[PDB]
Design a protein around this ligand. Structure first.
Ligand SMILES: O=C(O)CCC(=O)C(=O)O
Ligand SMILES: [Mn+2]
Length: 202
DNA sequence: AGGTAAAACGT
DNA sequence: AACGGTATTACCT
């Protein structure tokens, strides 16, 4: 059974690419470090984040923003690694979105206990562009709901190499990650990473 | 008028 | 511990 209208899970899709993806996460973060962002209301998120590409997701006192500049370094986010871009395009194509041109990649790092509460990915300049979401490392339980917060959730374990793609009818669906269990993975040791690809600009 | 914060405590 | 309240408003443009 597929995930939803316009949505699919490509299990272990990124497994072969994962070692290089992780090397390139480390390179990105060497330039724009992982940081735990603070919400407009003043709470520090448990997931640590950075970005690459032309636009990075950030919080600010005034809201959420896709920005061309990393507010911590005052420099552009690092260029999107070719490994990231190539994996993203292969996964998008396999999922039925062959024309996707991301300009933004949000890199999440989950330590044990870290979560991401149910939310919608908002800001869609192209209603035909999906979200491509790549899991690395330790396993996590992903929630995928509907257009309204109380719509029933599907709960899916996401393991190393899994890729989730949503878009079209499901582009604005609520989703999140449950608190990460401690464990070991040979390539990330003690964390999970996620890559979220978007077209956030015109 | 219409979008966005809550991507964040009690039962 | 899964579910849902809260934004049932206060601000911006
Ligand atoms: O880590 C995940 O699988 C989900 C990440 C996410 O929803 C986000 O960064 O917007
Ligand atoms: Mn998201």
């Amino acid at each position: 059974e597929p995930l939803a209208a316009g949505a699919v899970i490509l299990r272990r899709f990124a497994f072969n690419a994962a070692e290089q993806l992780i090397r390139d996460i480390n390179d990105v973060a060497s330039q724009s470090p992982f940081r735990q962002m603070v919400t407009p209301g003043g709470y520090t998120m448990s997931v640590a984040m950075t970005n690459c590409g032309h636009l990075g997701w950030t919080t600010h006192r005034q809201g959420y923003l896709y920005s061309p500049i990393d507010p911590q370094t005052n420099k552009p986010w690092p260029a999107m690694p070719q490994s990231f871009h190539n994996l993203c395009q292969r996964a998008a194509t396999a999922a039925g979105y062959p024309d996707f041109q991301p300009d933004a990649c949000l890199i999440n790092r989950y330590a044990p206990g870290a979560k991401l509460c149910l939310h919608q990915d908002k800001i869609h300049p192209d209603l035909r562009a999906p979200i491509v979401s790549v899991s690395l490392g330790l396993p996590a339980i992903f929630q995928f709901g509907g257009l309204k917060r109380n719509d029933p959730l599907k709960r899916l374990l996401l393991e190393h190499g899994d890729v989730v793609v949503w878009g079209g009818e499901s582009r604005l669906f609520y989703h999140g990650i449950q608190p990460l269990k401690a464990g070991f993975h040979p390539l990330t040791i003690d964390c999970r990473y996620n890559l979220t690809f978007r077209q956030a600009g015109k």
